[PDB]
C-alpha cells in the first residue's frame, strides 16, 4: 500500500496501493468503492473540502522506469470524476537521470524494488553515475507541423502536448497493451508493456507512422521473438485522435529490426510514402494506394548481408531522384526509379560507395547541393554536383562513446532554410564527474561555412529539433522546453 | 539574431527529499474553493477550478527574486516545501500566498492580478537545519525540521510566532525527537505520529509509534510495534 | 477514471483472396430458391416501373413471378406454340412476345385475358422483341426472316420501318439510352450493325465485327456496348467506334448478359454474364470489366438477369437454365389511464432551453471467455478456451490474450488429467495449422514441463501423447519438404 | 410585463425598477454602462408603489406609495431615510421636484408642496374644477415655479401664486399616461392604450403637432432641444423621432424603428429606454427579472433596425469534463484496431491416365468446384502427365490456385504438397523466362516462408517431446 | 424537465429551463445550506438509480449520485427521498443530508454534498413514509430526528445527531395500512428555516393513508403518552391520502389525493375544522397530484395532471 487518509469524520479510509485503483473503506460495515484504472499508479491520496468534497491525489506514472512521470488528480466527492488533472510532458529516456527511485513494492522488479533492494539499488545507480561513459538519455520526439504539436512516445502511449500552452492535451494508447485494461501485480511487474520505439509523421500531417517490438513474458520457448510490428493512422485538424488504418506484422521478415524510418516529401507522392531502412541493409518503400484504404509494398531493396549492425540511416533528395544510405562504415546513393546504384554514364567519379572511418550515425542534406555526415567519430561536410569535400570535425574527444546508434539521428535535425544545428553534451567536475551536465547548442549555416552560434546551457539537453516556425526546441532532463530563435 | 528562452515547464515541485512524511501533496486550494495553486518546478501556476484552464502563471524566471532564489544554476536544493493561503503579517487582507521553500524563506506575493515585482521577503532564524514542514492552527504556526548528528534522520518541532519585528520570527524550539523512520502529521493538523529505533536498541522490536499533540500535550503516547504485531507475521 | 477497453480480437494476415465489400455483397445475394418449368426458359425481364415483377419465358407459357413473394403471379398461355422474347415498356405496363408464328402478341401486363395487340410479323417465327426506352410508342421485333421491324401502335397492320441489310439468323438487336435513333443489331456472322432509324436505316450507318455469332448486343453506357457471343464477348465504344476491351474468361458460349448501375451497392456498376453452365460471372466496366463475381449451376444456364437500380426492396438475381431450371438468389432487407399516468416520456427535449445528458450506450454483450479473464478466474476462462462448441478463431484469440496478459503457468497450475485432455484434444485438432503451431508449442512444452510425472502417472495421456508426436513428425516432414520447396524456388527465381 | 414600474437617472447612467415578488414589492437600482444584488423590501404587502422619482448631495429616489407618504430613500445607504406624510389616507398619485420644492398630486385631486432642506410640508392645497387628475409638471421657468401643469384626460394649466387655472387644452379620451415639458411653450402629452402625442403649444393655447406611435405607447423620453423624442411602444419597440419640430403636415411619423430579436426568431421586448444627443441607451429584461442593458447611435443605425441577443434556446449544456462522447477528458483514450486491415512484410504487392483437358479447361475458366473435384486425386504418375502436357502460363496460374487453396486450407496441403514440386519441376524454364517471379508466386512464398519460420520451433518442441518421452517411458 | 419559474400575482415568468434525457422527474426539491447560505443546490430523482445534483449564468454544473458506498442491494431506485440539515454536533458543523427508502426497511442516509454513505436505519415491515423532526436543543444546537412510519400503523422515532438509534416506539390508533406521513408546524422541508437561531420544534403530526383517514395528533403529548391518542380523526377525503402539507406558521394543513378530480381539503388548527368554503364545486383543480406552501406570503400552488399549475394566495398573511 502507499496512501492511508482519513475522513474528517474518520469513518473512511482513502487507501491506494500499488495497482492503479482508489479504495474507498467504510469503516463501519467494513465495505469498499473502488476506482480501478488511473493511467498510472496511486502514491498519495487526501480529502481538501471542508465537507469533504474534493479528493486530491499524487499519480506516479512509473510504466517509465527512466522518468517517473507524476501527474496530480483532483475528484468531485460527489461523481467520482476526475475534476482536475494537471501533468507536464513524459520524456522516455534512455536511462534514469538524477535520482528517479522505483517505488517499494515486495519484489524487486523491472520496475520496482525490495527494500534491501532500495539501498543497493540507489548506491549501484550513484555508483553506474559516477563510473560509465554512456549518459546518452536521447529520446524520441516528434512534430506535427500542420498543428505545431508536440508528441512524446511514450512507453506503449503517445502524449500529445502543446508547448505554447504548456500543456498535456491527449494520452493515446496504441498497442495491444494490458497498460490500462488491467492493472499491475506482484509477479506481473517482470511483464512489460510493448515499447512503441518509433513515430513520426507524414509531411502532409494526416497519417502517423509508429514502429514498435513486442516483449513476450520470460522462461518461455517463444521468450526470446521480438515481433516487431509497423501501424500507420489517420486523424484529421478537427479531431485529436488517430485511427488506426493499416497493420504491419514482422516486416522484412521475422525478427529483424526496421530500426531507420524516412518518410516521403510532398514532392513525391504528395507525402503518401515511408522507406524502411534495416541492419540487413533492407530499404522497403510503402505507399498509399489510390483506390484502396491501405497502403502496400511499392518498391523493395533487399540486400541480405551476413553481418548485422542497426547504425543505419537514409536520407531523401528533395526532388526524391536519389537516396542517401549511410551504413557501417559505407555510404550509399540509391536511384528512386529502380532501387538501384547510382549510375552516371558521364563517369565524373560521383559515384556511390564512399568509405568512412566509424560506424554512419547521420546523414543529412542541407539542400540538393551540401551533405552533412555525421559518424561515431567525427562529422564531415561534402558536395553533391562535384565530389568534394569542405568540412571537417572531430567526436572522438567528446562523442567518443556516450551514446549508442541513432542517438545522433534523434538528436540532431537540419532545418531547411536557416543551415544545421548540432548538440554536445560535457559535465563540470569537482575532483569524479560530477552528475551536473552541462551542454551546448550550436548553429552552423551551408555545411558548417562558420558557425552562426554558439550557446552553452548549464544543464543537460536530451533532444532538440525546429519548430516549422523557424525556431528550434530542445529539451531538459526535467521536462523543461526551451527555445532558439529569431 | 539567435536568442535562447525557456517556454514550457513539467514536473511539479514534489517534495521527494523529505521521503517520511506520507502527505506531500502541498499544492493546495484556496480559502474559497475556486482555484487551485500548484507549484512546478520552475513556475506556480494558479487554476480556476471550474473552467479547468489555466487562468494564471508565476514563472520564476520572469520574476526577480524567484528567478535569484529558486533559480540557481548551480544547486537545486532550495523548492517549495508549503503554500499557505493566509497572509502571516496581516490580518484578514485576499488574495495574498505565503511560499515557504527548502530553506526557510518566507515570501509573500498576490495573485489574482498582476504580481508586483516587490515581493514581502524574509528569512526565518535558526536555518541551520533544514525546513521540512510548516502548519498553523489559529495564530500559532509549527515549523518540522530535519536535523542530522546510521543513515537515520532527527526531527526538531519549533512554534513559529511573528510580528514582533519585521525579520523577527520567534521560534520557541518546542521539542525533538531523534531516527525516525517514518512520520505523518493530522489533516486538522493537530496530532503527529512517528516512529524510531530507541526500542530496536532497547528490545527485540525494530520500531515503535509515539503520537504527539502540537498545540497542547493531552496526547503524549508511546507503545511498540511488537505489542502491536501478530505472531503469525 | 477510464473505461474497461474491450478485448482486441487477433486479426490474422491477410488471406489471398480477401473478402472485399464487393465479394460481401456479392456473399449477401442470398436465398437462392429453385423452382421447375417444362422446357429451356427463353427470356427473363424485369419491370422498369415498379421492379417487383419480372417476366420468363417458357413451353407455351410466359410467366410473371413477383419479388417478396417470389410466386407465379400472371400466366399467359394465349399461344400456339413456344415463346420467344419477352419485353416490358418503360412504363412497365405491356409486355410483348415474340412466339414461333412469326406474330408478336403485346399486351397490358396484369390482364393475360386481353391481346391488346397481335401484329403480324414475317411469316418465319419472331425472335427477339423489345420496346424503346425514352420512346414510349415504338416496337422492334426480329424473326427468321432476317430482317428487323420497327413498330408504332397506330400502324399495327404496317410496318412503320423495315430495317435490312443483315447477313443471316438476325437473333439480336438494342437501342442506345442516348441517341433515341441509333439502333445496333447482332446478326449469327458476329459483325454487329449500327443503323438510324431517323435515316433511311436500310443501310447500317456502321458495323463492328463480331466474327463469331453474336448473340447479345447491350448499350451498357452512352458510349459503349458490348457484344456478347461465342466463348469470349468484346466490349467496344461507339465514339472510338473500336473495341476498349475484350474477354474470353467464359466457358462455353455465353448465352446471356445484363447490366445494372446506380443502385445500394459498394460496387457502382455491374455486367453479368450467363455462359451455359450455370455459370454466371459479375464484372463491372469501372474496373474494365475485370473478374469480380461468379456462380455455377449444374443445369446449362440459358437466361439470366438482375433486379434493376430501383428495387426498393430485396434485391433478385435470376438464373434460368435450359433444364427449365429458376435459380432465384434474393437479397433480402396499457390502457388510456396508464397512458395519462405516464404520458411524458416522449417529450425528447425540444422547447425548453438548456439540454443536457449523461447516457452510456449499451455496448456489445459480453462472452463467457471475456468475462472469466476480466474478473481474473484463469482456470475457468482457459476451460471456457476449450469447451468444446466454438470457433478456432476464438480459441486462438483467446489463448493468444491469455498468455499475453497473464502467465501460461498461473493459467496452467492445478488441473487434474481429465481437465487436460480438452486442451490437448485442441492442440491434436489446430498443431497442424499455421497459425497457431508456435503458440500451441508453447503451451504444450509448459504443460510436460510442469506436469512430467504425471504422464506417467495417467495412463491415457501417454498415448495422447504418442499420437501428437506422430502428427508433429509428420509436421516435421511437411517443414522439411517447405524448406526443399524454399531451396528451388531459390533457384528458379 | 414584470417590471411594475421603472424611471432612468439623469445622464442616464443608472435607473431604479419596483418590482413584485412574492406579493411584496422590492426596489432595485442598477447602473446601465457595464450586479447589483441590493434591493429594498417592501414590509407591507398592500402598500404598493405609485411613482418613482430621480433626485441627484447624495444620490436619492422619492417614492411616492399608497400608504400616503412620500419616502425619500438614499441608494447608496440603501436606506429609506425620510418620510413625508400628509394629512390623509390616501394614495399619492404622482410626484415631481426641482430644487427644494416639491410637489404632488393626491388622487383626493389635492396638491402639496414640500420642501426638502426642511424636510416639511410647505402647504396643503385644493383646486376647484380639477376632478380627476394623474400626472403634473412644473415648467422649467427658471428658478421661478409658476404656471405648472396638471393632466388626466384634459391637459391644465394652473397657476399657484394665482392658485387657479388659466388655459385649457383638450386632453385625451384615456387618462393621461405620460406629461413632459420638450422645451418653453411646447409639451408632449401622451394617453393610455393610446398610439397619439400631442404636441401643443402652451401661449397659444394650440396644437402645435401629433407624433403617431406603431402601436400603444407605454413608455417616452427624449433629448435636451426637441432634436429627438424616442417612445417604448408596448408591443416591445422603440420609435424615434428626429428633429419633430419642423415641417398632411399635421401628424408625423415614426423617423426610426427599433427591435430586439433573440436568435431563434423570438421577440424580446424593450422598456423604458433612454435617449441622449447621438447616443441612445436600450433595456430589456433577460432573465425573468434581471435587466440587460445597451448602448448603440441612433444616427448611423438604418431607419428599421433590429438589435441580435444570443440566448441559450437549445443550448447544450458541455461540461469541461465529460468528452463529446462516453468518456471523460483526463481518461487516457484506449487502442482499438477496427477493421483495419492486415498485411505482413512478405505478401508483395504493386512490385494414359492425364486430366490436362480438365485442369485446361478449369484454369481458362477458374471453377472452384471443378477444380477442387480435380486436385482430389493423388496420383504421382498423373501428376507428372498432366504438368507435361500443361501449358506454361496455364501451369503458372495453376501454381497460384494452388498457393491461395493452401492459405485457405492448409490442412488440403499435405497431398497438394507434390503438386507445387512437380510443377516446379516441369515448368523450370518458363519460370527461368518470366521476369517478375516474386509478383506470380508471391503468395506461395508467403505460404512456404512461414512454414520454414514455424520449422525450427517445432524442431525444438519434437526435442522436448522425445526428451519427456523417453524420460517417462524407461521410469 | 426542472423548470424554475419567478412568482407574482399578475407574471410568473420562467427563469430557466432545463432538460434530462431518460431520466423522468419523479421528485425534485431546492435546497439550502444552513452554514454558508450560498449553495443553492437542487436535488432530483426518479424512476432510476442516479440522482442529480444542480448547483447554483449559461452552462449548467449538475453532479449525479448514482453509486452507493455500502450498498445497491437494498433499493431498487431512487423515486422517493428527502433532504435535511443536520449537525455534527461533535464539530458544530452543519451540513445536508439525504433520505433514501428502499426495499422492507431500509433507509438510506447520505451527505447531500459528497455523496458519502453515512449511516442506514432499517425499518421492519414495509417501509410507506418518513419524515424529519428537528430539535433546538440549547442556544447553537439541535437535534434532528427521523420518524418513519411502517404499512400496520407503527412509527418508529430514530435520532441522527449521534448515529441511527431508536428514540421510541409507538401505533397510530387505527391507520391499517398508512400511505404519507408529515410532521409540521414550524421549521421543516417545505418551511425552511435560514440560520441555526430559526429552528422551532414542529407542533402537529399527521399521518394519512388511503382508506382515507388523516390522524392528527399535538407532539407535546403524544411524547410523554406513547401511545398517543389523536387530537382529530380526519376523514372528508373517501379515497387515498397522497399530500400532506403543513402551512409555514402550522395553522393551516392541506390534504390531497391523487385518484379522484378535485380532491384537496384544507384543515384549520387547532379548531381542526375543515375549511367549508374552499374548494367550492367550481373550484378548477383538477386530478391534484402536487401541492407546496409559500414560505412566507401565503401562496398556494397546485399542479394536477393536465399539466397546469394554479396559485392562490390566502389573503389572510
Known sequence: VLSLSFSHDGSYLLSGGWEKVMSLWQLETNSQQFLPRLNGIIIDCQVLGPQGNYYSLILQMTENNSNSDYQFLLLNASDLTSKLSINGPLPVFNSTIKHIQQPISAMNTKNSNSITSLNHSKKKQSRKLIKSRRQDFTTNVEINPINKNLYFPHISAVQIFDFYKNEQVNYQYLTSGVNNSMGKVRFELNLQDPIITDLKFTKDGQWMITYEIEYPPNDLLSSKDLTHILKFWTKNDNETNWNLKTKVINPHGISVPITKILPSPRSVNNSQGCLTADNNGGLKFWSFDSHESNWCLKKISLPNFNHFSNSVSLAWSQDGSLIFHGFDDKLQILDFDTFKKFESLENTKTVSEFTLDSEIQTVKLINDTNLIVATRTTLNAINLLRGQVINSFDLYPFVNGVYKNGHMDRLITCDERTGNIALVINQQLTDVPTINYKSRIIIFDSDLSTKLGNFTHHEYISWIGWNYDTDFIFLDIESTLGVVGT | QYKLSVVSGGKPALNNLSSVTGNKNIARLSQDQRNYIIPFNNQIKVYSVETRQCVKTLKFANNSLLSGIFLQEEENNESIVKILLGDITVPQQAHLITVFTNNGHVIVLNYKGKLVESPKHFKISLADEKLANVFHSEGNYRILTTFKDNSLQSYRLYALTFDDAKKQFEVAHQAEWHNVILSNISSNGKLLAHMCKDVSTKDHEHKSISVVSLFDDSVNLSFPLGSILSSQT | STARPRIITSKAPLLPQQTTPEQRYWRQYTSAQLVKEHNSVTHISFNPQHPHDFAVTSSTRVQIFSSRTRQVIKTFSRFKDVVYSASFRSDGKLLCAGDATGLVSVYDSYNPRTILLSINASTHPTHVTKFHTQDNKILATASDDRVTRLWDISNAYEPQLELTGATDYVRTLSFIPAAPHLVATGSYDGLIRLYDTRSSGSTPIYSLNHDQPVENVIAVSPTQIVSCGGNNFKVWDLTSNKKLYERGNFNKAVTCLDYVENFDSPMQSALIASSLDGHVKVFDPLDNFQVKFGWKFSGPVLSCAVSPSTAQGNRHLVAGLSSGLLAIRTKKKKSNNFQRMMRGSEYQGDQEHIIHNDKVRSQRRMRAFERNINQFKWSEALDNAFVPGMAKELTLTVLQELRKRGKVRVALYGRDESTLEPLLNWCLKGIEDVRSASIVADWVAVVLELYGNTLESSPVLQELMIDLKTKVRHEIHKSKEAQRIEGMLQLLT | ?475 | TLRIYHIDGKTNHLVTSLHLVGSPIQTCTFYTSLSNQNQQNIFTAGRRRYMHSWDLSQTAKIEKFSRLYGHESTQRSFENFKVAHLQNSQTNSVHGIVLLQGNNGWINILHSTSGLWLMGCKIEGVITDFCIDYQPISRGKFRTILIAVNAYGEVWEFDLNKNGHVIRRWKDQGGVGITKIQVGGGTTTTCPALQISKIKQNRWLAVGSESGFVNLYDRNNAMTSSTPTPVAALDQLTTTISNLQFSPDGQILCMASRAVKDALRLVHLPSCSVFSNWPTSGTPLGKVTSVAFSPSGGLLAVGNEQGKVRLWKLNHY
Open chain 4, 1 to 475: 410585463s414584470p417590471v411594475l414600474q421603472s424611471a432612468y437617472d439623469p445622464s442616464g447612467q443608472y435607473l431604479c425598477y419596483v418590482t413584485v415578488a412574492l406579493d411584496k414589492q422590492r426596489v432595485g437600482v442598477q447602473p446601465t454602462q457595464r450586479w447589483n444584488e441590493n434591493f429594498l423590501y417592501l414590509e407591507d404587502s398592500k402598500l404598493k408603489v405609485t411613482c418613482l422619482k430621480w433626485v441627484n448631495d447624495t444620490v436619492a429616489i422619492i417614492l411616492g406609495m399608497n400608504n400616503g407618504e412620500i419616502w425619500l430613500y438614499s441608494v447608496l445607504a440603501n436606506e429609506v431615510t425620510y418620510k413625508f406624510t400628509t394629512g390623509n389616507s390616501y394614495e399619492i398619485k404622482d410626484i415631481d421636484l426641482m430644487g427644494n420644492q416639491l410637489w404632488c398630486i393626491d388622487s383626493s385631486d389635492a396638491f402639496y408642496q414640500f420642501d426638502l432642506l426642511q424636510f416639511k410640508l410647505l402647504q396643503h392645497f385644493r383646486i376647484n374644477n380639477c376632478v380627476q387628475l394623474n400626472k403634473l409638471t412644473i415648467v422649467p421657468a427658471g428658478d421661478s415655479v409658476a404656471q405648472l401643469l396638471v393632466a388626466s384626460h384634459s391637459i391644465s394649466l394652473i397657476d399657484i401664486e394665482e392658485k387657479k387655472v388659466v388655459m385649457t387644452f383638450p386632453g385625451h379620451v384615456s387618462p393621461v399616461s405620460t406629461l413632459q415639458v420638450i422645451t418653453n411653450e411646447f409639451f408632449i402629452s401622451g394617453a393610455e392604450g393610446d398610439r397619439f402625442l400631442n404636441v401643443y403649444d402652451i401661449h397659444s393655447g394650440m396644437t402645435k403637432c401629433v407624433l403617431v406611435a406603431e402601436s400603444d405607447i407605454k413608455e417616452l423620453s427624449h433629448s435636451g432641444q426637441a432634436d429627438s423624442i424616442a417612445v417604448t411602444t408596448e408591443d416591445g419597440s422603440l420609435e424615434i423621432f428626429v428633429d419633430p419640430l419642423v415641417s398632411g403636415n399635421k401628424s408625423k411619423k415614426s423617423s426610426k424603428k427599433i427591435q430586439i430579436v433573440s436568435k431563434d426568431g423570438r421577440k424580446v421586448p424593450i422598456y423604458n429606454a433612454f435617449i441622449n444627443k447621438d447616443l441612445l441607451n436600450v433595456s430589456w429584461l433577460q432573465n425573468a427579472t434581471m435587466p440587460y442593458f445597451k448602448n448603440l447611435q441612433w444616427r448611423e443605425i438604418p431607419n428599421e433596425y433590429t438589435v441580435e441577443i444570443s440566448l441559450n434556446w437549445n443550448n447544450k449544456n458541455k461540461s469541461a469534463d465529460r468528452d463529446l462522447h462516453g468518456k471523460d477528458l483526463a481518461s487516457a483514450t484506449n487502442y482499438v484496431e477496427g477493421n483495419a486491415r492486415v498485411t505482413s512484410g512478405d505478401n508483395f504487392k504493386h512490385v494414359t491416365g492425364t486430366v490436362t483437358v480438365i485442369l485446361s479447361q478449369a484454369l481458362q475458366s477458374n471453377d472452384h468446384s471443378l477444380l477442387e473435384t480435380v486436385l482430389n486425386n493423388r496420383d504421382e504418375r498423373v501428376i507428372r502427365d498432366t504438368i507435361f502436357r500443361l501449358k506454361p502460363a496455364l501451369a503458372v496460374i495453376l501454381l497460384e490456385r494452388l498457393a491461395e487453396r493452401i492459405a485457405r486450407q492448409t490442412h488440403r496441403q499435405g497431398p497438394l504438397n507434390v503438386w507445387v514440386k512437380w510443377c516446379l519441376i516441369i515448368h523450370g524454364g518458363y519460370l527461368v523466362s518470366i521476369p517478375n517471379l516474386m509478383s506470380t508466386l508471391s503468395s506461395l512464398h508467403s505460404t512456404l516462408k512461414r512454414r520454414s519460420d514455424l520449422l525450427p520451433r517445432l524442431l525444438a518442441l519434437d526435442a522436448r517431446l522425445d526428451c519427456t518421452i523417453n524420460k517417462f517411458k524407461t521410469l
